[PDB]
């Protein structure tokens, strides 16, 4: 990660020191007033809502380095009530007030850029899944997961695709059950030493082609490897 | 919108002049190996994706103002293969190449800002919706079709909310539920898509004040 390292070492030079969090903190919760810009480095997070009656809907996850936002950077106003939850045992993360990461960007446009391009992808990765999703149904769309999975996590190994994740964070319904299942028969995948394995990753690559074309664009180095 | 009019006088005082399309004109297809910037001033289009084997899918609508960038800023490279089709009547648009963009920007950052800011609107619009769909599978999808829609071109009346646009721009199980709701009301739509009104409510408070 070249971006992400001297996008750390700025903020560091800017005098904002990293922090850990651990399970079931928030990073930020629905009810902060201040609008943050949070840099989580390393670990992996969720942003979550709660619906009127309590109910916890986990809508995006994200997997250090990456940018989180809070507040709109030209009127400073909230994008929206959610929640930033780690999943991810303990992770470091910035956090960098909405209005001071209005300043450090305009002092410094490289940096500018790269926050810039990461809501880019972001952007694009939705109308890619989508994609993927209007053509196959959820055939295309679980493929997709498995397919996103699988190129940050895939480790080439002599006997299938060895998949770097915990057991349970990693499938954290019949529908989903009965792909799987055609999945596990036609060797595509396997659950083997209680860990998904993928041994024709081409089949996930061609149900979900433009979330695969995604991962080309915005991740080459990503996406070469195991290619 | 006074960012846009403002990005608008903006950009032609440093040489980029407006073009006016016809529906179903692409501004730009999937194909093309440049990658722009369209600051779609007027006018709605759609950005379309068409399969390998013909099939046309829609992704995404936009109206203007808004910014739509089929590069990425810096390294320049496509963020994906897209086709932006006009469905309006006619719309107006200035076409940018992306590596001019960054200069321009990069010298206003006030403008920075504006189209950061339209990029950030449309991620927490999809992460808004999908908090609906996961809640409301295809209806809170659907409903929060129909209330942005009326929000955008609302206008309060006794006889009830109305949008004023032709059958023109208009166009299974999804017109069997639009009939399953036909059979029973600003407020359903707002029932099972809230967090899609609580997005229009933060990004577009002044015109989600409408009916409110």
Same mark, same amino acid.
């Given at each position: 990660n070249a971006q992400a390292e001297e996008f750390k070492k700025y903020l560091e030079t800017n005098g904002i020191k990293p922090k850990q969090f651990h399970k079931k903190?928030?990073? #930020?919760?629905?009810?902060?007033p201040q609008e943050y810009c949070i840099f989580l480095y390393d670990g992996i997070t969720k942003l979550t809502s709660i619906s009127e009656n309590g109910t916890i809907m986990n809508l995006q996850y994200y997997k250090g380095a990456f940018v989180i936002m809070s507040? #709109?950077?030209? /009127?400073? /106003?909230?994008?929206?009530?959610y929640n930033l939850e780690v999943i991810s045992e303990q992770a470091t993360a910035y956090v960098i007030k909405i209005n001071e990461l209005k300043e450090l960007l305009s002092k410094n446009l490289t940096h500018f850029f790269y926050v810039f391009q990461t809501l880019q992808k972001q952007v694009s990765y939705s109308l890619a899944k989508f994609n993927d999703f209007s053509i196959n149904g959820k055939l295309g769309s679980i493929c997709g997961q498995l397919l996103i999975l699988t190129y940050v996590y895939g480790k080439e190994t002599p006997?299938?695709?060895?998949? /770097?994740?915990?057991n349970l964070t990693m499938q954290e319904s019949s529908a989903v059950s009965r792909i799987i299942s055609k999945l596990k028969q036609e060797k595509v995948i396997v659950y083997k030493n209680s860990c998904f394995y993928v041994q024709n990753l081409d089949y996930l690559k061609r149900y979900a082609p433009k979330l695969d074309e995604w991962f080309y664009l915005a991740c080459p180095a990503t996406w070469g490897k195991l290619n």
């Amino acid at each position: 990660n070249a971006q992400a390292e001297e996008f750390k070492k700025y903020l560091e030079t800017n005098g904002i020191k990293p922090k850990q969090f651990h399970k079931k903190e928030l990073i #930020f919760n629905q009810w902060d007033p201040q609008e943050y810009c949070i840099f989580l480095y390393d670990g992996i997070t969720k942003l979550t809502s709660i619906s009127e009656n309590g109910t916890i809907m986990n809508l995006q996850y994200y997997k250090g380095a990456f940018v989180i936002m809070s507040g #709109f950077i030209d /009127t400073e /106003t909230s994008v929206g009530y959610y929640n930033l939850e780690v999943i991810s045992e303990q992770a470091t993360a910035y956090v960098i007030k909405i209005n001071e990461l209005k300043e450090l960007l305009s002092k410094n446009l490289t940096h500018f850029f790269y926050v810039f391009q990461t809501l880019q992808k972001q952007v694009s990765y939705s109308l890619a899944k989508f994609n993927d999703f209007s053509i196959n149904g959820k055939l295309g769309s679980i493929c997709g997961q498995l397919l996103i999975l699988t190129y940050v996590y895939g480790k080439e190994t002599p006997d299938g695709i060895k998949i /770097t994740l915990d057991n349970l964070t990693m499938q954290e319904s019949s529908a989903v059950s009965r792909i799987i299942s055609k999945l596990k028969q036609e060797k595509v995948i396997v659950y083997k030493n209680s860990c998904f394995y993928v041994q024709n990753l081409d089949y996930l690559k061609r149900y979900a082609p433009k979330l695969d074309e995604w991962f080309y664009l915005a991740c080459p180095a990503t996406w070469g490897k195991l290619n």
